[PDB]
Design a protein around this ligand. Sequence first.
Ligand SMILES: NC[C@@H]1O[C@H](O[C@H]2[C@@H](O)[C@H](O[C@@H]3[C@@H](O)[C@H](N)C[C@H](N)[C@H]3O[C@H]3O[C@H](CO)[C@@H](O)[C@H](O)[C@H]3N)O[C@@H]2CO)[C@H](N)[C@@H](O)[C@@H]1O
Ligand SMILES: [Mg+2]
Ligand SMILES: [Mg+2]
Ligand SMILES: [Mg+2]
Ligand SMILES: [Mg+2]
Ligand SMILES: [Mg+2]
Ligand SMILES: [Mg+2]
Ligand SMILES: [Mg+2]
Ligand SMILES: [Mg+2]
Ligand SMILES: [Mg+2]
Ligand SMILES: [Mg+2]
Ligand SMILES: [Mg+2]
Ligand SMILES: [Mg+2]
Ligand SMILES: [Mg+2]
Ligand SMILES: [Mg+2]
Ligand SMILES: [Mg+2]
Ligand SMILES: [Mg+2]
Ligand SMILES: [Mg+2]
Ligand SMILES: [Mg+2]
Ligand SMILES: [Mg+2]
Ligand SMILES: [Mg+2]
Lengths: 70, 155, 119
Amino acid sequence: KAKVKATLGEFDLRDYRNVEVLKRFLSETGKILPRRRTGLSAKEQRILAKTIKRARILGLLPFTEKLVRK
Amino acid sequence: ARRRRAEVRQLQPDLVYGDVLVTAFINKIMRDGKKNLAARIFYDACKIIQEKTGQEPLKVFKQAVENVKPRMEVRSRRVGGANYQVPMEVSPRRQQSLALRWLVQAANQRPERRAAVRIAHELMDAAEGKGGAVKKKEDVERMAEANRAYAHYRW
Amino acid sequence: KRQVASGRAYIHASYNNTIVTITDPDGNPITWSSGGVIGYKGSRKGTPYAAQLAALDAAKKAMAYGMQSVDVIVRGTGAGREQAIRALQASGLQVKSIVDDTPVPHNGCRPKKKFRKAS
RNA sequence: UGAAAUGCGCAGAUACCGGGAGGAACGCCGAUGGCGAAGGCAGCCACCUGGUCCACCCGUGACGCUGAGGCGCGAAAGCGUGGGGAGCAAACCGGAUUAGAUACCCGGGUAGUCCACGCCCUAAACGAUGCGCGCUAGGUCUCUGGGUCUCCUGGGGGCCGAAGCUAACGCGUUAAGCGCGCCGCCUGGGGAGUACGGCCGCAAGGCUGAAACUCAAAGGAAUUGACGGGGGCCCGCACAAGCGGUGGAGC
RNA sequence: CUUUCU
Ligand SMILES: NC[C@@H]1O[C@H](O[C@H]2[C@@H](O)[C@H](O[C@@H]3[C@@H](O)[C@H](N)C[C@H](N)[C@H]3O[C@H]3O[C@H](CO)[C@@H](O)[C@H](O)[C@H]3N)O[C@@H]2CO)[C@H](N)[C@@H](O)[C@@H]1O
Ligand SMILES: [Mg+2]
Ligand SMILES: [Mg+2]
Ligand SMILES: [Mg+2]
Ligand SMILES: [Mg+2]
Ligand SMILES: [Mg+2]
Ligand SMILES: [Mg+2]
Ligand SMILES: [Mg+2]
Ligand SMILES: [Mg+2]
Ligand SMILES: [Mg+2]
Ligand SMILES: [Mg+2]
Ligand SMILES: [Mg+2]
Ligand SMILES: [Mg+2]
Ligand SMILES: [Mg+2]
Ligand SMILES: [Mg+2]
Ligand SMILES: [Mg+2]
Ligand SMILES: [Mg+2]
Ligand SMILES: [Mg+2]
Ligand SMILES: [Mg+2]
Ligand SMILES: [Mg+2]
Ligand SMILES: [Mg+2]
């Protein structure tokens, strides 16, 4: 569909507290989205996943969700 | 029928009531190419419908057939190990053929000594819903549906 | 027995059986069915038709507790699954939501030989 | 499970919710990606630590390459001592299947798989390709630096391909091309990685490694077929759908 | 399905 990167302005993707931003990079099942979807550079996507994994331990982001209407 | 889908052999309308479905029946009655004797029989039988009811023969026969048509049948089926009886819907053609096939086999199972009679009574009984044809049929519709677990092939 | 008007339908589709269990909205089970509880035994419990019948049976037993609607929750992939769902929907019983909640390791325990194959 | 049975379940199993214990492994990200000399390395955090790339062109001044032996590292399995043990699981105990089934399938299940310390030192330890250096068209995709950031310039990973090489398959600036240096190795097949001896090892075993006898081959790549319980496309009264038969009786 | 041998 349309890339998640393209729907945002600047943002520090080292920022493991900005759950508002971070959360659009997760799927409806709280799974880290692949680059095909996130629209990221390899290097960026590496840094992302790292800080997504931080948010998660902080309690700020989900490790999982359940799929609604299936 | 590897290549094409086979032309449904299209049938001479009836000499008497002007209906295609009747020749079809007369044909299933017919042995060894003797369409004459076959046709006597079916007509003789239609006369026995008259004398034994105020009904017009044609619409007895029509409505008998309609009562012998199966809705579902069980065609056998390989599953890389076992052959299962698989329930599935029945082509309008096949409805019609199986009907007339069973009408005549049912007819010829009967006790009455003369063919025109057996044809006649079986027809009567069938429009009513209680010929030997209809048992050889609710038997089918039963067996399909009593195998309804395997309706998830259909092939 | 108690009157609960809505609660959960928990479907457990597996390649060997669908088991449908119905609960109050806190998760305590009211009734339950399975391919075995219906007539079936052995390989036939797996069928989608088995699924329908269990879904329908367990939904009937649940309407005996005056159940009106359910949150559906599915787990496992299995022949009977969308069939078990389709049953509930068309059972009188009203289906508010449907939710896949199939449990999955964040790779953890070694599978049995049969389920390693992806090795 | 093909179908089952063994098995578990009214001491209440399965499915469902809540709480707790433990063991082991980290899903998405994840790649045709990255790192390491190899083996090999994957949740997150901190500490300790090895390598390596780019820019400046500041320093030393041939200080270099290779490397018998030595020394160290070295997947899994295996061993010792002591922990630990959730799941999986050689052996083993059962159920199926089968002509039989010491297997393939199902149910149990010990060693082991896990940790620490000490052994073992092997491999399809593979790129089946020793290390270093220079030289010889390009194109394309990718990871990671720098620039005047359309494009240029390093380092790394792929694909196609100049010249060229190759038995062919293929290689082709990441050479299997053209050259130099230094090391390791080969010398028909079987006997045989056997015997003997030595060294090492707790053991299991490992390294080194023959001969007699015996064969006229053993091999590699590619060609045409043929075949497949490989693939794709398609036919035929081939099967299906039908109607009549044979197999029964007399002749 | 099933197929040990030839
Ligand atoms: N994950 C921990 C790390 O693992 C390494 O080793 C340690 C651990 O991994 C290892 O296992 C620990 C153990 O500590 C402890 N006594 C028992 C505990 N269950 C284990 O836990 C750990 O390892 C197991 C392996 O799956 C898992 O629990 C889990 O992956 C991890 N939490 O034991 C080692 C020390 O006891 C490194 N030594 C260190 O970086 C750190 O402990
Ligand atoms: Mg079953
Ligand atoms: Mg629990
Ligand atoms: Mg490797
Ligand atoms: Mg200088
Ligand atoms: Mg000077
Ligand atoms: Mg080792
Ligand atoms: Mg080991
Ligand atoms: Mg040990
Ligand atoms: Mg056995
Ligand atoms: Mg087993
Ligand atoms: Mg087990
Ligand atoms: Mg290569
Ligand atoms: Mg390059
Ligand atoms: Mg090439
Ligand atoms: Mg020799
Ligand atoms: Mg060859
Ligand atoms: Mg050939
Ligand atoms: Mg036929
Ligand atoms: Mg004969
Ligand atoms: Mg033999």
